[PDB]
């Protein structure tokens, strides 16, 4: 040993160190990048409800269908009373990558018979461990049924003596969300007194048709998509809104306001609220704006670190509480703490306000392969929560590099961002031809930073993504023909159209527009009048940019108005927006053109002291 | 001091980390903040950057402080030629293949030791092979890159 071995370790040292430095400094901006672009997206699909809730002001105020299913089909057999075997021959079913279609039949019987069940519950369901001395909560689940299945492995299915709590989210962003579904209902058939489910902001079938779900179920059962799917939103009608923890705990999955109050959420009628972000369907009784309120507080609330409530203005729905409401709540209701899920976190569970809000989030690698961990919560009968981690798919994640293992999740950011980017594409040319008087090609990097950020409005770190972005560019411009050739080229113009977009309101729910156009009714009759339809595209066009631009809709009604206004006429009537939206989805493309088998034991695992963490 | 560009990027950079947005952070986390803006320092060299810096104990640096610290510690620097003969001295016999024993006993007891989890990543990822032998040369260049 001399003094230059000493100088060589730690100068290679220091090297490692800042090597590792960089790589958390490049995580930490792709997680920023991934939660940002998510935020951007459900702000602009919650926008509806600002809609619906102003043209309210505004304005006065065992049938058997199911046929024979084309292709491949399994004869798996599932009879009415559910039993223990029943769910290990529909995981085996479910297990294998390929040939997983079961009977429309046994679908339409668990559906039905899971809506029927689901009618007893009360609203808030009281859940105790005096004799089980031991329950189980499981975040968000969004579809990964791998999780699920690797969960139930690690804790054993569920029984009198081990209850499972499931906190929202089961379907709509994975690729295999049915699955999921039908397999917790068939565990809480099974086990009516241990399982326990919550409804959560995904549990709703205007957010279905956004982020995939109607796509896949129609995909699978094209000859039966339509029955599926109205036994699915009935299901969605009964699920209780929260659960209670031995009388001390709340689990709920969004969180809480200021004027939320448990003894007012146990007295709404459940039924009336198919749908979150539309008006509920009446029997002639208008509506309340409170129990609404209530409701989409419950469901869609996040927590702040600063004092005070504001309205939540980063995912565009519900409220920001801090801790002063959070102990002003916990005193008027006499709990304990509250246990959350709606926030994805790298690790899969967070503390908030002094270890009162306890944030959790099963689904791991819910952005990329990489993303995150999973975890769940396993309370003891003094309810100190044991969290627990997982990583699913192993086997396929060992057998890259590490630079690779981060190369791919900054490939999927990267192609992410752009595909996002590329609906600015015109503005934002414009924007940066305005910025160089002199045609020179080239922008100060201010001037640039700042033009993303107005255009784009993320709130990225834009400075950080310089050299990527627009890559070989010096310490003082960066020319804009560079960052315009990335939104242009043909792989992300395939990738972006695969990506549904906002509106297309028809093909998303016609029950949409059905509410819409029974809210406008002055009169009972169902008859309209120009004038308030003008009013109410006004409206419409005033939230929604580039909607009709208030001439297709009245020249429609104008080549239909033969006997003047009057009734909603039927589906001839809705072809002024069949004719709209093609019309500008051609004017738009036109536009655009003229330039492994499932295995609980592959993965990782982890148990984390409660205090440790 | 900093340039012009520079006031804004290490701005852009500390939002990062920043858990209330106040512009201010843990001082646990300087080690990783500095070293990510080229710097490489060792933390004996933080110790006594705190030192200077932290009089009550509060745990808190907003920004002035990090620039003031940054413009310092910015005026020495070193370039990645460097690196190749830390590794060459390690090498009895001018083989090049060291093995992956001596390479973990070194580092984690001599000089300033790291804890468990960087040599288990360090040697994860430099032991591709199974023959318990890391090529630094491969190392360094992809590394490097
Ligand atoms: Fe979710
Ligand atoms: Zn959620």
């Known amino acids: 040993m001399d003094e230059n071995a000493i100088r060589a370790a730690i100068f290679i040292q220091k090297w490692y160190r800042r090597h590792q430095a960089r790589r958390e ?11 940002n672009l998510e935020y951007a997206s459900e702000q602009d699909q919650a926008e509806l409800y600002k809609f619906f809730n102003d043209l309210i002001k505004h304005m006065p105020q065992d049938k058997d269908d199911l046929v024979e299913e084309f292709g491949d089909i399994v ?127 995904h549990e709703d079938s205007v957010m279905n ?90 469901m869609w609330s996040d927590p702040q670190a600063t004092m005070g409530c504001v309205p939540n203005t980063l995912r565009g729905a519900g409220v920001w509480f801090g801790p002063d409401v959070t102990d002003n709540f916990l005193q008027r209701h006499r709990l304990s703490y509250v246990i959350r899920s709606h926030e994805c976190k790298p690790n899969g569970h967070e503390f908030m306000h002094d270890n009162k809000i306890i944030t959790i989030f099963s689904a791991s690698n819910y952005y990329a392969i990489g993303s995150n961990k999973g975890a769940y919560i396993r309370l003891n009968n003094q309810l100190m929560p044991h969290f627990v981690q997982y990583i699913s798919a192993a086997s396929q994640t060992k057998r890259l590099s590490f630079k690779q293992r981060m190369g791919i999740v900054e490939s999927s950011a990267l192609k992410e961002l752009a595909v996002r980017m590329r609906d600015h594409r015109d503005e934002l040319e414009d924007e940066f031809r305005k910025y160089d008087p002199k045609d020179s090609g080239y922008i100060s990097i201010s001037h640039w930073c700042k033009v993303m950020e107005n255009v784009t409005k993320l709130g990225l770190p834009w400075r950080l993504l310089r050299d990527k972005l627009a890559p070989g560019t010096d310490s003082q411009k960066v020319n804009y023909n560079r ?8 792989v992300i113009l395939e990738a972006e159209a695969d990506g549904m977009s906002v509106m297309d309101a028809l093909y998303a729910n016609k029950a949409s527009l059905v509410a819409i156009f029974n809210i406008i009714d002055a009169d009972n009759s169902g008859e309209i009048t120009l004038d308030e339809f003008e009013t109410a595209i006004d409206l419409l066009v005033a939230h929604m940019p580039g909607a009709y631009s208030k001439a297709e809709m009245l020249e429609k009604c104008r080549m239909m108005d033969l006997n003047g206004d009057g009734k909603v006429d039927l589906n001839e009537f809705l072809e002024a927006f069949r004719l709209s939206d093609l019309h500008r989805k051609e004017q738009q493309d036109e536009n655009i053109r003229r330039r492994h088998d499932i295995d609980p034991t592959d993965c990782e695992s982890k148990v984390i002291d409660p205090k440790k963490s | 001091q900093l340039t012009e560009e520079q006031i804004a990027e290490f701005k852009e950079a500390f939002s990062l980390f920043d858990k209330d947005g106040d512009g201010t952070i843990t001082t646990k986390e300087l080690g990783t903040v500095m070293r990510s803006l080229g710097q490489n320092p060792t933390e004996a060299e933080l110790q006594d950057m705190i030192n200077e810096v932290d009089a009550d104990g509060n745990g808190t640096i907003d920004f002035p402080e990090f620039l003031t610290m940054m413009a310092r510690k910015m005026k020495d620097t070193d370039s990645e030629e460097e690196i190749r003969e830390a590794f060459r001295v390690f090498d009895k016999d001018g083989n090049g293949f060291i093995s992956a024993a001596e390479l973990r006993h070194v580092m984690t007891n001599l000089g300033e030791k790291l804890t468990d989890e960087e040599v288990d990543e360090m040697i994860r990822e430099a032991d591709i092979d199974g023959d318990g032998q890391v090529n630094y040369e491969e190392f360094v260049t992809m590394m490097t890159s």
């Open chain 1, 25 to 35: 400094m490049q995580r930490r901006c792709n997680w920023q990048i991934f939660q």
């Open chain 1, 75 to 201: 004869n798996a057999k599932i009879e009415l009373p559910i039993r223990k075997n029943h769910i290990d021959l529909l995981i085996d079913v479910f297990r294998k990558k390929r040939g997983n279609r079961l009977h429309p039949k046994y679908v339409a019987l668990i559906l039905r018979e899971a809506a029927k069940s689901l009618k007893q519950l009360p609203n808030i369901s009281p859940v105790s461990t005096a004799v089980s001395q031991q329950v189980t909560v499981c975040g968000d689940l969004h579809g990964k049924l791998d999780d699920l299945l690797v969960v139930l492995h690690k804790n054993g299915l569920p029984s009198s003596s081990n209850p499972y709590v499931f906190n929202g989210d089961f379907v709509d962003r994975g690729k295999r969300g049915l699955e999921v579904l039908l397999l917790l209902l068939s565990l809480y058939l099974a086990f009516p007194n241990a399982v326990f489910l919550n409804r959560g902001n």
């Open chain 1, 209 to 298: 048709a956004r982020y995939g779900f109607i796509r896949e179920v129609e995909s699978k059962y094209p000859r039966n998509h339509k029955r599926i799917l109205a036994f699915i939103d009935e299901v969605y009608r009964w699920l209780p809104l929260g659960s209670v923890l031995n009388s001390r705990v709340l689990i709920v999955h969004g969180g809480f306001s200021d004027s939320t109050s448990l003894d007012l959420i146990k007295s709404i009628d459940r039924g009336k609220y198919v749908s979150i972000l539309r008006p509920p369907l009446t029997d002639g009784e208008p509506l309340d704006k409170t129990e609404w309120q209530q409701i989409f507080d419950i």
């Open chain 1, 483 to 490: 960052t315009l050739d990335l939104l242009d080229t043909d």
